[PDB]
PDB file of C-alpha atoms in Angstrom:
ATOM      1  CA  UNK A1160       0.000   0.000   0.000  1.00 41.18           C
ATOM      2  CA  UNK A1161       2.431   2.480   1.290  1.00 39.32           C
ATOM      3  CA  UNK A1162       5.440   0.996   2.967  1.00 37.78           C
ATOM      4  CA  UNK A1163       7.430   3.668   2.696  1.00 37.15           C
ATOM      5  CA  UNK A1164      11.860   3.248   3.478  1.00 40.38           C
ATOM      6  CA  UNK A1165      12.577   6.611   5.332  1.00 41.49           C
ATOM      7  CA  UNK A1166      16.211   7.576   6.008  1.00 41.70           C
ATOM      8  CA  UNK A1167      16.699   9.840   8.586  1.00 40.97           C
ATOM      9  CA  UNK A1168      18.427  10.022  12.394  1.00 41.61           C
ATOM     10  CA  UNK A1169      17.306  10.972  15.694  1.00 41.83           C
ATOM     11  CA  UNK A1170      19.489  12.352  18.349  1.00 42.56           C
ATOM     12  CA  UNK A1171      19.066  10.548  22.414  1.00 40.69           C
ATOM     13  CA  UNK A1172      20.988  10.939  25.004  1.00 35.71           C
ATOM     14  CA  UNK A1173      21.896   7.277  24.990  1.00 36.59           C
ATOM     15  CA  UNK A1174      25.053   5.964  24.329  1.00 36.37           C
ATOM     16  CA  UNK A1175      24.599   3.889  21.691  1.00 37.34           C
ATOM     17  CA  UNK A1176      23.251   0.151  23.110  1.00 38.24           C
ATOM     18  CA  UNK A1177      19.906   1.089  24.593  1.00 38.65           C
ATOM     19  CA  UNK A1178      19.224   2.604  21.735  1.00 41.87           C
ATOM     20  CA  UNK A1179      18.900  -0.233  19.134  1.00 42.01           C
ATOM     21  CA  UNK A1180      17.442  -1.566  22.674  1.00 39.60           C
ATOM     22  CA  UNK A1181      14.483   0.868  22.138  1.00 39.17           C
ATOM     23  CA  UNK A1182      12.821  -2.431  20.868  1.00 39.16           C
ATOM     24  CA  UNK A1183      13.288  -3.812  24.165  1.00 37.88           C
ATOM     25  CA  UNK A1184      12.590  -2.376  27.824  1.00 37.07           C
ATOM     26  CA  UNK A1185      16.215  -1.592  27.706  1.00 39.17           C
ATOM     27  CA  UNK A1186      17.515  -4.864  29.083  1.00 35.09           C
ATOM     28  CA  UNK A1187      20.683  -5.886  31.384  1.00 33.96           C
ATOM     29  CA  UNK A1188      22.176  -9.420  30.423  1.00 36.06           C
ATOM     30  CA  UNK A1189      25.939  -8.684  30.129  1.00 34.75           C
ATOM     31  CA  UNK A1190      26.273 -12.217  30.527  1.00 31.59           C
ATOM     32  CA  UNK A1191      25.000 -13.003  26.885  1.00 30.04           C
ATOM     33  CA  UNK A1192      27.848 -11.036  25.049  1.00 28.73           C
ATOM     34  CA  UNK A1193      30.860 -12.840  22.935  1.00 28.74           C
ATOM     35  CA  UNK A1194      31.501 -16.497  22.456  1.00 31.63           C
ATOM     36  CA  UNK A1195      30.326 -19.001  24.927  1.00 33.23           C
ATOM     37  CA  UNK A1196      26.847 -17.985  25.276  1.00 31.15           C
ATOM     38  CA  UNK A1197      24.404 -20.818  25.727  1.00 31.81           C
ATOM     39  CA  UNK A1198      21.511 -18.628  26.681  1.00 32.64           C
ATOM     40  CA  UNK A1199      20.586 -17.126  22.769  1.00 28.76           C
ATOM     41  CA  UNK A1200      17.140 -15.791  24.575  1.00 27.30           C
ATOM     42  CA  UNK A1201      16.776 -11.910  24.046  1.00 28.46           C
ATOM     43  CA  UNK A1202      12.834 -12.015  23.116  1.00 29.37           C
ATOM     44  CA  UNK A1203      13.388  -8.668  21.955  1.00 28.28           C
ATOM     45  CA  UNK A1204      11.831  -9.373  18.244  1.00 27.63           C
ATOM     46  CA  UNK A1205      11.050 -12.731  19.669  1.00 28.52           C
ATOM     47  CA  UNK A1206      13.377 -15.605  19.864  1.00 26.49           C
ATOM     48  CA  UNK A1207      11.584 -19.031  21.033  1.00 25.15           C
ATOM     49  CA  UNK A1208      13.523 -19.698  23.836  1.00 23.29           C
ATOM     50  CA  UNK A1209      14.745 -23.523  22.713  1.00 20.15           C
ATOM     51  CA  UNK A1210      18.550 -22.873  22.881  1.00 19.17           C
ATOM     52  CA  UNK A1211      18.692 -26.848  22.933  1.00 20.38           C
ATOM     53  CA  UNK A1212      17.479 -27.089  18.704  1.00 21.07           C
ATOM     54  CA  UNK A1213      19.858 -27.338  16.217  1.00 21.49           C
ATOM     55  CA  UNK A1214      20.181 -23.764  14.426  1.00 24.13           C
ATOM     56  CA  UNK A1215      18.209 -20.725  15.516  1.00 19.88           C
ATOM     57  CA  UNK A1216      15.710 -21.567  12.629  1.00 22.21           C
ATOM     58  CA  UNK A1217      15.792 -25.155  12.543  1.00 25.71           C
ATOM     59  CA  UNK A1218      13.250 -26.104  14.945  1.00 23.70           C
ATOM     60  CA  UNK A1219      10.698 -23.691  15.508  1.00 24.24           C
ATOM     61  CA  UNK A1220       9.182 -22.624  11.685  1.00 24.92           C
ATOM     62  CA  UNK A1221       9.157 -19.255  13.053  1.00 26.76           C
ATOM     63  CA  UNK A1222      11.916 -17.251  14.852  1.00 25.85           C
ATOM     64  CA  UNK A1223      13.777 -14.171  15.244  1.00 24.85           C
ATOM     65  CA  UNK A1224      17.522 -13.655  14.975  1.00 22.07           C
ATOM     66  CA  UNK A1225      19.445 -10.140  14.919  1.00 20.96           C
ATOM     67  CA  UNK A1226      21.906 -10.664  12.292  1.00 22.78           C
ATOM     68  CA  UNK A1227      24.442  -7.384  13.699  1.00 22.15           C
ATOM     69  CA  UNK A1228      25.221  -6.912  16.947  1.00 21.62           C
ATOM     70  CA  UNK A1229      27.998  -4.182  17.449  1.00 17.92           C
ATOM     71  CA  UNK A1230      28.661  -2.188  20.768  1.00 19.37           C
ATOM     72  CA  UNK A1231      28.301   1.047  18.936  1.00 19.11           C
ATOM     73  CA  UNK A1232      28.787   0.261  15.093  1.00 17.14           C
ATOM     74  CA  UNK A1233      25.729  -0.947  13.310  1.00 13.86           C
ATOM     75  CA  UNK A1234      22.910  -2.990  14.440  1.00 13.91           C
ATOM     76  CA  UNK A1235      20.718  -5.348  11.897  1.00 11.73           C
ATOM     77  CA  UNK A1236      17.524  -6.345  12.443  1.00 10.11           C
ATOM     78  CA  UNK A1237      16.567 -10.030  11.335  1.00 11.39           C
ATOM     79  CA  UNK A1238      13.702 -12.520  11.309  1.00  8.50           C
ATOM     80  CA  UNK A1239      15.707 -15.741  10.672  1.00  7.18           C
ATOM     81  CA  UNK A1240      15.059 -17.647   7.427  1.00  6.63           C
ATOM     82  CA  UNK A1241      12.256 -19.682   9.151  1.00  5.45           C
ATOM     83  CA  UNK A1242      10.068 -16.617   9.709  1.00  4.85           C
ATOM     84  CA  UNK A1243      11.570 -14.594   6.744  1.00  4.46           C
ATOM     85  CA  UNK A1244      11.886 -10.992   7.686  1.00  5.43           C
ATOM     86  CA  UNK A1245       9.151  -8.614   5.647  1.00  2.88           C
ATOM     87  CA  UNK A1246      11.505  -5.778   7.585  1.00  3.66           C
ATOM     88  CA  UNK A1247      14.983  -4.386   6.652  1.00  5.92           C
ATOM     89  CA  UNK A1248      16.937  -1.594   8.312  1.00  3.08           C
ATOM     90  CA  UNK A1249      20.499  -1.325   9.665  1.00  3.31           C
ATOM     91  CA  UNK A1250      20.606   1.078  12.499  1.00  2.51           C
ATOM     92  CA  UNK A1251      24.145   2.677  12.496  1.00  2.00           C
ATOM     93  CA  UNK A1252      25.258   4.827  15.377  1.00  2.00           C
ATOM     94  CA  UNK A1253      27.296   7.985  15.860  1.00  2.00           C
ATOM     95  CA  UNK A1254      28.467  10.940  18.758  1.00  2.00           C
ATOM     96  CA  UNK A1255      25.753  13.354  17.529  1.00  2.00           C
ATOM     97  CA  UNK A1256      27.524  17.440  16.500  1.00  2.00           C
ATOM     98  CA  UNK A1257      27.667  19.694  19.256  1.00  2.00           C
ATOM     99  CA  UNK A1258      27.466  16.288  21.916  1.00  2.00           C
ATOM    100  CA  UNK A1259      24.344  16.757  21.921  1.00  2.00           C
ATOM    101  CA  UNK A1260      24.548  13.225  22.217  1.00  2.00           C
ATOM    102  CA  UNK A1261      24.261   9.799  19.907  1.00  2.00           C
ATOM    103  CA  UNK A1262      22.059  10.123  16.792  1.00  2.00           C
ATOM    104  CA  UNK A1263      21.199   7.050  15.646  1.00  2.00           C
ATOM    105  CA  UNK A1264      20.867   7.246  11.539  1.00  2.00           C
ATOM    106  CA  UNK A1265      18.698   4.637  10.332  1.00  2.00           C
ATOM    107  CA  UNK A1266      17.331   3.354   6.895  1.00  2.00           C
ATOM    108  CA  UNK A1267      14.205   1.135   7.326  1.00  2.00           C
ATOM    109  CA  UNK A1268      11.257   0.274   5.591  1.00  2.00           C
ATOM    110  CA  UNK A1269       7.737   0.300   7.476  1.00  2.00           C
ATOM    111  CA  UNK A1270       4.032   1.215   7.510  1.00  2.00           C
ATOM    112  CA  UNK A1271       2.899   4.648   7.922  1.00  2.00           C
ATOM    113  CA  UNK A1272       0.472   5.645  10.386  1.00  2.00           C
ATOM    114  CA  UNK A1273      -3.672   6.906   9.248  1.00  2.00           C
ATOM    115  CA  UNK A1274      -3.990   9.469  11.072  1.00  2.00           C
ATOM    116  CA  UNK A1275      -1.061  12.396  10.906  1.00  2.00           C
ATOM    117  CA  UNK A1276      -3.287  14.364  13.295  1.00  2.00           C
ATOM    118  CA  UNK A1277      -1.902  12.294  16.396  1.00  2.00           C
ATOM    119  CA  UNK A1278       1.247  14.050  15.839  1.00  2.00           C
ATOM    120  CA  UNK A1279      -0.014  17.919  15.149  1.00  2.00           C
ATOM    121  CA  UNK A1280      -1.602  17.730  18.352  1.00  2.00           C
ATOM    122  CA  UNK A1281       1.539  17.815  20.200  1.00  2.00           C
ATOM    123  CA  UNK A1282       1.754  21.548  18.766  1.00  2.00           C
ATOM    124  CA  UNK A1283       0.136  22.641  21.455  1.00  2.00           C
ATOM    125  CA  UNK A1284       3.039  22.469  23.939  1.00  2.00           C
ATOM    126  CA  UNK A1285       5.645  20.231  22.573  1.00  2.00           C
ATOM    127  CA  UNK A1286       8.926  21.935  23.731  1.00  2.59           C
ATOM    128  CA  UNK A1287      10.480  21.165  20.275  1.00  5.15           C
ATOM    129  CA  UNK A1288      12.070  22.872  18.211  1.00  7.42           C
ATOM    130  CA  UNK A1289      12.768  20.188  15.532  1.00  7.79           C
ATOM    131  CA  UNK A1290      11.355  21.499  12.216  1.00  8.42           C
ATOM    132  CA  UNK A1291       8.161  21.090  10.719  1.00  9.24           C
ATOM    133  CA  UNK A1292      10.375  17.944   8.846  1.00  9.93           C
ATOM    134  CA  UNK A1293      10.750  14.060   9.962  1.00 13.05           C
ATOM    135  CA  UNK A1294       7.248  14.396  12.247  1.00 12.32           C
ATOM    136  CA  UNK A1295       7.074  10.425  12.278  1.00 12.12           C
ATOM    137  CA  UNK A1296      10.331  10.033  13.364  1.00 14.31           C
ATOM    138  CA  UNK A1297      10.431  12.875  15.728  1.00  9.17           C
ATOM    139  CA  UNK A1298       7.800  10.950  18.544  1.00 11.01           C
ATOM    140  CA  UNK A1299      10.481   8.086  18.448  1.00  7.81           C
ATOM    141  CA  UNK A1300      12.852  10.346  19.250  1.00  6.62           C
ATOM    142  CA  UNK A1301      10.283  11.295  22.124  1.00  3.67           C
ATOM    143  CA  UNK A1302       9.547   8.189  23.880  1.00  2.00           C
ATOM    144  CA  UNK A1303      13.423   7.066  23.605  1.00  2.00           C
ATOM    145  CA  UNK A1304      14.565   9.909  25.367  1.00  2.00           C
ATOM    146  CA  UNK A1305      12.031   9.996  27.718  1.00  2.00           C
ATOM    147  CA  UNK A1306      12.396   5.996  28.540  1.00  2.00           C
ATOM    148  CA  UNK A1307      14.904   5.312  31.244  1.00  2.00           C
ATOM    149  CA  UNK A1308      15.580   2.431  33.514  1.00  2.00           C
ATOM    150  CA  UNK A1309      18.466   0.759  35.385  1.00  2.00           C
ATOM    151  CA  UNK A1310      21.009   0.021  33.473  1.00  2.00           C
ATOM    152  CA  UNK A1311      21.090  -3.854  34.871  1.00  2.00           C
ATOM    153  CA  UNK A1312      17.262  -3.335  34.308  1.00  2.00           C
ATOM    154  CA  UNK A1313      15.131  -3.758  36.945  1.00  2.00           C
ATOM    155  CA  UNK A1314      11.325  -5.864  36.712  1.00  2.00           C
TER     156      UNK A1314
END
């Protein structure tokens, strides 16, 4: 209909890994990082928490897998190739100018929302300055930086 791929990148005041974490309630499992992991349960865009199956796909018919995981580079979202991702974006990450932070440039493909009123009303008293440009993307940029938690996470 009107999946539409918009490029464009908001700033946070987030260093880099709770950002691609927005999809998540900005977790804390520092134990799941390099080699040796035998937990591969994140949830985050689902997971089906087997760990026991033979490959991350090869079990469950449908699955999801995040395909880059980088510090602060570049993170790739992923669907395995037993769900088949309809998605596609790379999230990339740099210090945004005047550290006003990390802006997190991002290329993605999605569906836009009905009704564009939801956003105008914010005119009222929105506190930001951001242009009359990237409305869509400037909410995200909204919720991010308002979102905060421990950083071991906390439930």
């Amino acid at each position: 209909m009107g999946e539409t791929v918009v490029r464009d990148a908001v700033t946070i005041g987030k260093p880099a890994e709770q950002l691609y974490a927005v999809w998540r309630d900005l977790p804390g499992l520092p134990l799941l990082m390099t080699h040796l992991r035998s937990v591969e349960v994140l949830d985050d865009k689902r997971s089906r928490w087997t760990v026991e199956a033979p490959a991350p796909l090869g079990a469950v018919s449908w699955e999801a897998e995040l395909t880059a995981d980088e510090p602060g580079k570049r993170i790739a979202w992923r669907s395995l190739p037993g769900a088949r991702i309809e998605n596609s974006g790379e999230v990339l990450f740099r210090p945004a100018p005047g550290a006003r932070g990390t802006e997190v440039v991002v290329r993605l493909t999605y569906r836009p929302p009905g009704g564009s009123a939801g956003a105008v009303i914010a005119r009222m008293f929105n506190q930001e300055p951001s242009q009359q440009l990237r409305d869509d993307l400037m909410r995200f940029k909204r919720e991010q930086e308002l979102g905060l938690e421990h950083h071991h996470h906390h439930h």
